[PDB]
Amino acid sequence: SMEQVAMELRLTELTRLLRSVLDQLQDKDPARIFAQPVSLKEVPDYLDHIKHPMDFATMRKRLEAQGYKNLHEFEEDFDLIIDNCMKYNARDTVFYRAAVRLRDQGGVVLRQARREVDSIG
């Protein structure tokens, strides 16, 4: 149907906007601490601590399959990156501190993203 195509175009355009958001948030992680999944070879106990691991590469795979239906779903995955790190790692660590800085800098980007998603529909 033509309605299904229109909905598909809206999803494609959201995917475009989320790709630009993802690029902007990942620039706030210049150390690349959040770029890839925590390695279970290198942190064998990880899944005992963290039940829903997340990272920027995993988000990009979902994004490219158009697997985010709305901005809330995308934000959920970004918050998992931050929140997972802030539980597993202690306050005095470069990992924890990187997550704080990513959260703080990312909030700015996300605030305008929300306006754009509502504005453009």
Side-chain angles (χ1 to χ4, degrees), residues 29-40 42-60 62-68:
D29 171 32
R32 302 192 70 85
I33 288 164
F34 308 104
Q36 292 293 331
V38 171
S39 171
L40 307 175
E42 303 169 0
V43 188
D45 73 358
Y46 193 63
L47 296 186
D48 295 340
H49 290 267
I50 296 301
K51 297 301 174 183
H52 294 100
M54 188 52 51
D55 62 278
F56 287 126
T58 301
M59 289 190 63
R60 191 171 298 276
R62 181 164 170 194
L63 181 60
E64 288 316 325
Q66 300 185 350
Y68 297 112

Side-chain angles (χ1 to χ4, degrees), residues 64-68 70-110 112-118:
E64 288 316 325
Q66 300 185 350
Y68 297 112
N70 56 52
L71 183 56
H72 181 72
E73 289 185 347
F74 179 95
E75 294 172 314
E76 283 194 337
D77 271 355
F78 179 67
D79 287 336
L80 280 175
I81 293 177
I82 300 315
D83 291 340
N84 292 341
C85 184
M86 297 174 67
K87 292 169 190 72
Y88 191 83
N89 304 106
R91 216 161 26 251
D92 71 334
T93 61
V94 63
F95 306 110
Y96 184 113
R97 291 163 172 281
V100 166
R101 289 161 65 82
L102 178 57
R103 190 200 59 189
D104 285 351
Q105 295 194 277
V108 178
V109 172
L110 288 167
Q112 198 57 38
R114 162 55 64 205
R115 293 191 67 85
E116 279 167 352
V117 169
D118 295 353

